[PDB]
Symmetry: D2
Subunit: 107 residues, 4 copies
């Protein structure tokens, strides 16, 4: 009964690819959806093979589509009150082809 | 106001068909196969479900970009709006694509920006 | 895995049709009309667009609850999954409803919980 | 080019109906989507006639469906850094009929 969301915007920076102690890959990157005004920023993380893919393929400013689950987390009342935390656990991402072409490769 | 939108992940059943209006507007059509998944109780780890073939058409440059960039098999992520399209007696449902790109799920890509 | 889902707002074209499988599973079908909107340049404030008739079917209690609660005209909000359903030669697209309720847009409601 | 989202969960409290100086009505209420675990909480606000509707119709614990736009806002670096703010500007809401019935009225 998870909650998905699709977001279209541009990466604020290059995707950060790292490897946990487990040996797994993570890409953290945040999307900027912009009316054309005040934008919607969303931290997204993707894992495993798709993360490496993202890192190779996408860059700063890259227009993307991202579908995934919204994961929130609340906190703060022993030091500053009423604070929230939000992100997307990406299921799929791809470079949008509205204003670009793409030479797709296999694996 | 709120157009009925959706998001769809799948693969292209065929190469993108790129066509034009008599005055020269580019429209490419293509269809997306999304096989969903699920468990299989009493022996059976995880297994494909239905199939879902959503007929998609797209317009202007994005159509021409799609056409350069996608082929049969291409894993895609598609966001768009649901339109009813009729013809010679009844009505078929289709997606009018707002955005589309290949999934970086099992692929890499070299994006080339237009302007 | 990811089933192709959508959300749809509209009104019921008819009263909900409530039916059963031979063994007694409740399935109600109904269809939703969503007219989208848009401007109208050079005189014309805002105006309806297409129409979109999405065939919806739903199962078990929610079906029976729907049937008590909804009629022709009922403004609804529907979230569900896209399924292809065939028959006597071709395939129609339909929504399998996960959740549905009347919009509180131009109505009030007295919710009565089950258990 | 706004970003919508549909959310299904239960209201954490009664809808707060207020009237701005303008004379307009606002309902603030937050949704709890729950796996059945750690939940997704989303502040939602609705306006005008639908807000009054909400206030009359819905209550604490009420299961709902909400479609609307995600509005984020970032801040904090002159006092505690790296903070976010998120909500849904509801376009439609209704009491879900999965576990309930509803006697719908007109206007």
């Amino acid at each position: 009964g998870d909650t998905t969301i699709t977001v279209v915007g541009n990466l604020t920076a290059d995707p950060e690819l790292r490897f946990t102690p487990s040996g797994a890959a993570v890409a953290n990157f945040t999307v900027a959806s912009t009316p054309r005004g005040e934008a919607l920023f969303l931290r997204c993380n993707i894992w495993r093979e798709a993360a490496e893919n993202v890192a190779e393929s996408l860059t700063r400013g890259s227009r993307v589509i991202v579908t995934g689950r919204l994961k929130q987390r609340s906190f703060e009342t022993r030091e500053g009150e009423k604070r929230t935390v939000v992100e997307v656990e990406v299921d799929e991402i791809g470079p949008s082809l509205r204003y670009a072409t793409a030479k797709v490769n296999k694996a």
